[PDB]
Structure formats: C-alpha cells, structure tokens
Amino acid sequence: TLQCTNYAPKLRSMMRGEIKNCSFNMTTELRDKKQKVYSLFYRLDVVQINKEYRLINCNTSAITQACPKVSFEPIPIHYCAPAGF
Amino acid sequence: DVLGHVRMAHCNISKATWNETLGKVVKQLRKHFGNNTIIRFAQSSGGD
C-alpha cells in the first residue's frame, strides 16, 4: 500500500497531478528490517485504493524490472533461409 | 527527483509536412473509395 501526495502540488502546468510522491515500507537486504522509500510515479502507473494507492498492475500481474544495463534501442535483424529454401 | 521545472513530454511534428503527407494519403485513398467522396480523419475512438 502506497501513501501518496501530488508532486509539485502548487505547480501551474499541464502536468498538475501527473507525478505523485509516494511513500512505502518495502523491505531490504535483511528480512527482519524494512527501509522506508519515497519515490515519484506517474499518474498512469498508480491507482487509488496522504491517500492510499497501489501500482496499477498489482491487480493483474507480476511486475519484472527490466535490467538497466540492456538497451531497448532497435537493432536491425536479418532473416536468412536455411539451406534448401 | 526532477531538477529544474517539471515539463510535459511532447512530440514536434512540422505542420506543413504532415499536411502534405495527408494530402498524398487522401489522393491514394480516393483512388479506392471514389474521386467524389469526402475523406475525414479523426482521433481514436477508444480502448487501452
């Protein structure tokens, strides 16, 4: 469960409420302790359930973090027929 | 954190080039739908 407020709540912009500043306990290297975390999420990733929110996907599926070291830039791929084709 | 001001993500598309692009698309669509029809473009109606 996330406890969130709006990021830059006094800002005049089109992005007024688009980024939410959420607080949560999560956990850490040792199973007996928890590390409180403050992070920013976009409105489209966080759904209401300080106000209480959850990540939009916790009602549908598991979330896997993409590796930060692997680029998403498209690279040309060629398709080659096997011999006989 | 956001350093500086919070700014909206956006895309820049030249208006003249796009308008010419659609004019070309409309001519090619008219070749299949009739020279005297009216072709209209609209935003996506719904879904995810």
Partner: antibody
C-alpha cells in the same frame, strides 16, 4: 535584466491610455510578462499578462472589458491599452517579469527567481 | 481575496510575522509569492515560491504555507526593514492573479 516603462502622463477622461515596456537582457519570448498597478496609498491590482511565445493573454475579470494587452517580439516590447479611463481608476503602472513560458505548455506560468526584475513604473493621472 | 493584517508591530530581536488567509482555490493549490516595497519605489519580491528566496535577499526573511494560509517571518526588525508587504497568488476561482491588501510595518 532591466525594464523601462514609458507612457502618457495626464490622459483625459474617456480617452485611450497606452503604455509600453522595453526590456534588455531577458529574451522576450522565454517569459510571461504582466502589468500591475497601484494608486499611491493603496494596494496593488493585477491587470493581465502575455505568453511571450504564443501571444495568449489573460485579464483581470473586473477590468477585462476595457483592457487589451499586446506584445511585439521585435524590439522586445510589451504594451497595454486601456479605454474608458476615469480618475477613480488611475494609478502608478508597472511591468514585471511574471514567469517562465515553454513552447510545449501555453498555460505553464512556471515560477522563477527572474520574476524579481521589476521596473520602477510611471504615474498616470486622469 | 487573500486577506492580510491591517498593520503590524515589531521590535529588534523579536520575530515579526505577516499572515495571508485565502482558500483552497488560491493559496491551498498555488504558490504564494512575497513582496516588499517602500513608498515611491517599485516592489521587489522577497520570496518567489512558497519557500524559496532569490540569491539577493538576506536570511532575515523566510516564509511558510499551510492549508489555505501562509506566513512571512522576519527574524528581527531593523530600522531599514519597515515597509509595505504584499502576498500574491493565482486564484483559480477568479481565474486571475490576486493580491492581498498588504500590511504596513512600523
């Protein structure tokens, strides 16, 4: 950054009042500019503003029907045109930098330190 | 629309505060700027965000905002500090930037 206000001194009742402000080192197109006035011995009233890029305007609803604000990026000038002027509605007029404007957001009004760059103003009588 | 004190006393060595009181449509949801002026001179701002100051303003001035009200604190009254103070904010009900009536410091 400097701003120099200029305009008429005594304007007769029902005549048009027109003021212009020029700025130096602040790029005109990068900021929102506004007009503020106060009679001597009285508080301040916001008149309206300009989006330095798009030309979009905003006016104080109590003044709106009698006030037009315009800009010219050439020569970095900002102008205010007020009609149906009366002695009850005169004041010392000022221009100030109001906020940062971005091309992607015509309603930005982004807060900035640069808003401190106020001119000294002119006294308008009627 | 943002109210301010009619005037305000103070002394060297004692904090002096100036308040503004508005609503959720003007102070509660928007930044409040603080200005200081002397008679015959244009105003200059002291605080450009609810908390942030320009690099040209001394540390004697600070401010905070809570709910639909805000307050400017002066850490001690100097003879050169007496001035007419104003707060400003954008009022989304009016759809205009709104000034308080200001206060006169003596």
């Amino acid at each position: 950054v400097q701003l120099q206000e200029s305009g008429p001194g005594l304007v007769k009742p029902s005549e048009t009042l027109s003021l212009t402000c020029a700025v130096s080192g602040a790029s005109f197109s990068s900021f929102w500019w506004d007009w503020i006035r106060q009679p001597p011995g009285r508080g301040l009233e916001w008149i309206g503003d300009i989006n330095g890029n798009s030309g979009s305007t905003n006016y104080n609803p109590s003044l709106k029907s009698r006030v037009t604000i315009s800009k010219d990026a050439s020569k970095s000038q900002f102008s205010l045109k007020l009609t149906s002027v009366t002695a009850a509605d005169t004041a010392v007029y000022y221009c100030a930098l109001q906020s940062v404007t971005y091309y992607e957001d015509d309603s930005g009004h982004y807060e900035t330190e640069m808003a401190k760059f106020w001119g000294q103003g002119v006294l308008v009588t009627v | 629309v943002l109210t301010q004190p009619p005037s305000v006393s103070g002394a060297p060595g004692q904090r002096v505060t100036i308040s503004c009181s508005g609503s959720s449509s003007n102070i509660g949801g928007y930044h409040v700027q603080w200005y200081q002026q002397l008679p015959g001179t244009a105003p200059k701002l002291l605080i450009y965000e609810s908390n942030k100051r320009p690099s040209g303003i001394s540390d004697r001035f600070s401010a905070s905002q809570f709910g639909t009200s805000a307050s400017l604190t002066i850490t001690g009254l100097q003879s050169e500090d007496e001035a007419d103070y104003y707060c400003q904010s954008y009022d989304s009900s009016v759809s205009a930037q709104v000034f308080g009536g200001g206060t006169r410091l003596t």
